[PDB]
Write a protein that binds this ligand. Structure first.
Ligand code: WUV
Ligand code: WUV
Ligand code: WUV
Ligand code: WUV
Ligand code: WUV
Lengths: 348, 348, 348, 348, 348
């Protein structure tokens, strides 16, 4: 017996939709949901989605509040819809998927993922919910996450981190590292060998290896010397060149974090969505060096060093394909005289 | 257990709110309420009110569907709020009153008119609803309508017509003529002797007396001759003078209806609400004669003739006060040499 | 190379989208599309849909401008989407279907109806477009209209009328009567024997048989006498009973048209969409007789007489199912002593 | 001392802006202006313009309420702005011009038309306002209307009709026929000899000559015979050909009015603004004959007969230029063997 | 061949409009532009301007991405429009100028600044764009910036800083100090001697002289002693007096920055736009001392000391005019017994 007033009751009393009975008076004005408290209107939700306001409010109240895979992982695995949950995309302030299954009458394409409409879609299944491992076993197309083994299914160890209420973290009190499984047309896939992005912020960047600690503490020349990185253009690619009007390199988040400690810069996120590679229009405040499309990836510095050191450096320009977050990332590799000139996630 | 989805269920299945259980999926976009039918959105309500869309939808669904007093009558009697009903104003496409009692959680100031918040307000009571005559006797301020006698209460016979779902009519299958009662400060008030406006339209105007039939069929000079109206300026007041740039007189609806048969005209209703006297910005299409503020009243021609023939014509200018629809309407009477020059509902 | 400015160029120069090259400056403000003419903004389109304004403008410009089946027929046949066209619903001022195929990048689920996403959906195909009969033979689910024979496919003769730019008409200069074909799960389905609604308006109702001419010209008792309709409750069902507060019967459009000639009435279309049976909240202006849910069907009076005269009248109450517009319409038949008491399209 | 509350006071009390002192409480919600009456909100203005609601409300209240040239005439004369008035376009529900002079602080480019910003613009001047003839003599660019002679200025007799509060009429109580004067680059320009469109509606079309009365009363063949119009393709051009899917000819409003008497048709005004030639997407209801772009002009039938009879008919196709409403209207003349095939206001 | 879909393609792929061919599907909902990515809507732009959303999106995509003069400088120089660029005002989130030249079809008044409409306007010209120095030489009214000498034109050295993508900076990798030139009615002006505001932020304030370093490091009494500022009321004007309910002085940004290090305060920017002098409604959090209109200017402390030390201190109150950012700034100077009481940028 779903209703706007019941969703609002749940938000006010339970912090989110919790299946509780009850109703609170609500008013809708433009794209905002309000409720009366002490005789005055209090805002419960402002719609930032392209869905109708009451519909978006319901999907947001029904968002998954357990650690879930980051949207970039789900997107890279081709997930179309989730089974009986809403994966809320905190970067877009919107549902990660267009439709739902057993969530909301306005967006539901089905009540159960066993309905024929779901068979062609890659349905996200959560092994932490009773019966969902079995539903995945019977599903034509799907992606499954579990905390442990599934009998007979060979797992893919996912990233250490997961998103919990829009906070990306490596769980200590909760498990965030999932086993991943994928079926395409009834066939359990062998998920590829993959690197994972680290999903760190610039403001609270923390190193996750001795190499990363050395990159942040050491000066450019002594780090490159210590790790034998001469000829790999880390001065351009990772540290960044701020000497010309066009900002040189700066494609690894760790390099942006090191620069951020010294001086600030503007990062215009012109396509604001979670993705393995992010594109920013960057303006360095200290120098005025800028770049319209600066592709940035947050790889563990050791993983980036392994990738660059594993390439043939004898060609002027070529595409280097690296599986990151289960997707194929194209990088452009530019070399001269057996040394790297630049290496960056391809802007295509 | 009120809800948007339950109000929508009632509208879809019962044509209005009928206390039925059930829910339909709804989407709100901007100021319109939609429901899904055959996979597509169908409009159930467009909010033309200053209330939030969902609140206005509920009051509209809960509108009174019995013949009720026309809003102009309620306004003239000082009605502030209705007891456990919504008087919908079909001319404003909005509730006739700001607040409610026992109707909707967002607009309710009380659940019952016996609550102390209602005591200072003139509450509308309907004797056709069980217990409402008793609530009127206990109310400090109120207006009561009944179909018959109330023991000990002196009645006022109201207009023949009432509004049924926005159609003003003299009931044949239903009763539309009510007894009216009013209380101010716990004391029943004597309602004055009053004329009533006829509530006719220009497009479908029908005469309601032999004098009115003669006005529409006869030529100006022979009507005035037949009814001995020489010296009462009906040529200006009722027929209208279209010979100058400023349209002369034309203050009785019957005169506008007679003119409308010959040639059309524009009537700008610049304050669009039901009132005993209406003000229009009129432009005559045939002549180009116009008037920014042309006060128009729809009185039965016999009643208007009785009013004008009952005035002293020996003063240049004076205010003539006539009780119409329970309100005192001020008219400006201009005379010269014992004859009327003009007589019009006095502009403010 | 689709664009808002190109769609606007087509609307301004061709009256609709006509595949022409060119661009006009456009401004979007709120839900309206404007273009500059003589230095000022001129409205090209007001969005009444739940789609984004620019998306709705494109689908509207790309609406089918040939005579097409009325939306009620498509809905009754289970049509979900149209192949490479937009069926515009002129009663809802919106696209008849949520998604498109080869029409607009924002609403397209596919470019061609042969894509696997279309297989589960009932795709509308138009034999007047080259290759669409072949696409229907290859489609798993679909509805096809043609002007002539399709080799081996058994046809269903559709209604005489079709909608041309929102005008329902029986074509004289164009063909409006189509052959209909339908497929479910890759199998051609036999369309049932059906009556067709006449799609007439109350304001411009025209009789289409000698019986219908006699119903409108003759008095109630002599019509019933002439057509031997004694005992079939036409007095209640067709003519309508306006003697009580609840309006009795009045379920055939021809009866509403006969009443409309004598006196007016309000018809609240509370679910405004094209359907075989319409539900209205009716208020008779002459009497004040009203009904919240008055189901009305526009059948040719001869067809309604054939239906009612073909029923067993020996049971108190039973459901009578009649195929009308390809859908099964349930009617409630109430009898007493071998005579009809009431017969109406059964309310849900 | 202009203000929103003062404009609203003027609208409520004077029917429009009348320079009166006073204020009324107003509320703005979305694009509508409301005022409180009897404790509830009453709509004073709904903004249909691309200006801010409060700005549009002020220009609308300050609209010219005297008979003014129809917007199509002003547009054809190149008018950009009006001197100290607002020409309201009643077909667009918006100001005819983007900017103002001495009207409203938000839209004013100047307080007086003598300011240098006005010199390049064609300013509309009204000889009925004191000092405006002098302002026209001092203006570099302008259009002047007067009721009589201006010493030394050669006049152009304008159309008989003018627009008074959105009603196009030939004044009887007011003057609607003006003398027109125009200046370009400080030099008075000779206005060309011109025909004038009649500005009639389809619903209330009235003939204005014996030829027009004969066209509406007589049958096609006897009218063409009486007026010796054999060989001028009036059967196609004026009467219209409804025998094929594409509606033939039908370019004179009088022909559409004659057809309208027999059967109705849909006229989609896809660029809704006043213009000498109008383009409609027409659908004939009787036949289903339709045309995406049907150019229609309302010329007096005698004027159209004079135009067509004054052309050389010995060429297959040529452009015929006719001055109508001061603008040069291009017509496409198609002939064969010394007879007209078609003649229509040439589509762009 | 400009279009919404092409502007969106450029934003998505190039970070801004870069003249690239291509189209992306877009949806417009209310004042926001979205594009489809991975089946879901991603926000590209939210309109904060008074222009139509699609128009503002285009001007924002076409903003100048080179270091440009800060809007306060352009405003102070009387710039009305820019030649073939958009100066985006990052403080108003809107275009700095109402109209454009060769930028966007909806806002363009001309395609080239040589068109007669541009001659009266002060057109901004950029010597870094080929041909713009020459266009300025031929322009009646304009402001020109260059990086070096223009033959024959005497330059005005502008501020050290410029705005690069909304970041005000003193360029190291790019040039931000321009030569300024101005023509008024075809005559090259002698730009006045001027101070420049420093355009610093409170959060990241950095001293730009030894005096400024001493002001931030030293205690009030020893700074005033070191720089011989006794009698100039720096205790009130620069340091600020927080001992009474009305906050005393505090008109130099450096003083606000020194206070900000110790304790925070609210600065309400009630007219949010770039200006030489800013007015704030300030509330000191530590003391509760507040001021509705606290004028603040960011001058180099040495420049402010030079200004105050160059005034006659023998009058109670007078206006002191100082050219700052090319505009005349009025300051109120209050003295008593040959000493300053207060000196502040005049609130007029
Ligand atoms: C309260 C509120 C939340 N949201 C979204 C933003 C975050 O993605 C997330 C936070 S729980 O939900 C809105 O969009 N509007 C709101 O008002
Ligand atoms: C359907 C509908 C109705 N109304 C109001 C208008 C009339 O006053 C009355 C008619 S039942 O209710 C709206 O305001 N919007 C609507 O959509
Ligand atoms: C001009 C226009 C049309 N439409 C819809 C209404 C009709 O169903 C149909 C008529 S062509 O198109 C709108 O919705 N808004 C418009 O402005
Ligand atoms: C009352 C009102 C008027 N207008 C415009 C429409 C007509 O062109 C004209 C009629 S006076 O003024 C609006 O736009 N909104 C309104 O509410
Ligand atoms: C993405 C975006 C930008 N803008 C404006 C803000 C800044 O002035 C500037 C930042 S590049 O552009 C908006 O107004 N809305 C937006 O969504």
């Amino acid at each position: 017996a779903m209703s706007l007033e019941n969703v609002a009751f749940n938000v006010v009393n339970k912090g989110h939709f919790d299946g509780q009975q009850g109703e609170v008076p609500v008013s809708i004005i433009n794209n905002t949901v309000y409720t009366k408290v002490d005789g005055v209107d209090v805002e419960l939700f402002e719609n930032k989605t392209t869905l109708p306001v009451n519909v978006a409010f319901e999907l947001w109240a029904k968002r998954n509040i357990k650690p879930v895979p980051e949207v970039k992982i789900l997107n890279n695995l081709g997930v179309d819809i989730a089974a009986n949950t809403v994966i809320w995309d905190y970067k877009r302030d919107a549902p990660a998927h267009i439709s739902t299954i057993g969530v909301c009458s306005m967006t539901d394409i089905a009540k159960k993922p066993t309905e024929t409409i779901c068979a062609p879609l890659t349905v996200f299944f959560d092994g932490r919910v009773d019966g969902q491992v079995d539903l995945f076993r019977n599903a034509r197309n799907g992606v499954l996450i579990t905390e442990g083994s599934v009998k007979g299914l060979q797992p893919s160890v996912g990233p250490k981190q997961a998103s919990l209420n829009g906070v990306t973290l490596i769980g200590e009190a909760v498990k965030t590292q999932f086993n991943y499984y994928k079926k395409v047309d009834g066939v359990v896939q062998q998920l590829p060998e993959t690197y994972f992005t680290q999903s760190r912020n610039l403001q609270e960047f923390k190193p996750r290896s001795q190499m990363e600690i050395d990159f942040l503490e050491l000066a450019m020349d002594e780090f490159i010397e210590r790790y034998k990185l001469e000829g790999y253009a880390f001065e351009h690619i990772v540290y960044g060149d701020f000497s010309h009007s066009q900002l040189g390199g700066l494609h690894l988040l760790i390099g942006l974090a090191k620069r951020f400690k010294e001086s600030p810069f503007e990062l215009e996120d012109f396509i604001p969505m979670d993705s393995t590679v992010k594109n920013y229009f960057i303006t360095d405040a200290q120098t005025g060096s800028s770049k319209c499309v600066c592709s940035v990836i947050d790889l563990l510095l050791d993983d980036f060093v392994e990738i660059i050191k594993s390439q043939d450096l004898s060609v002027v320009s070529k595409v280097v394909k690296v599986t990151i977050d289960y997707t194929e990332i194209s990088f452009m590799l530019w070399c001269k005289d057996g040394h790297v000139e630049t290496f960056y996630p391809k802007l295509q």
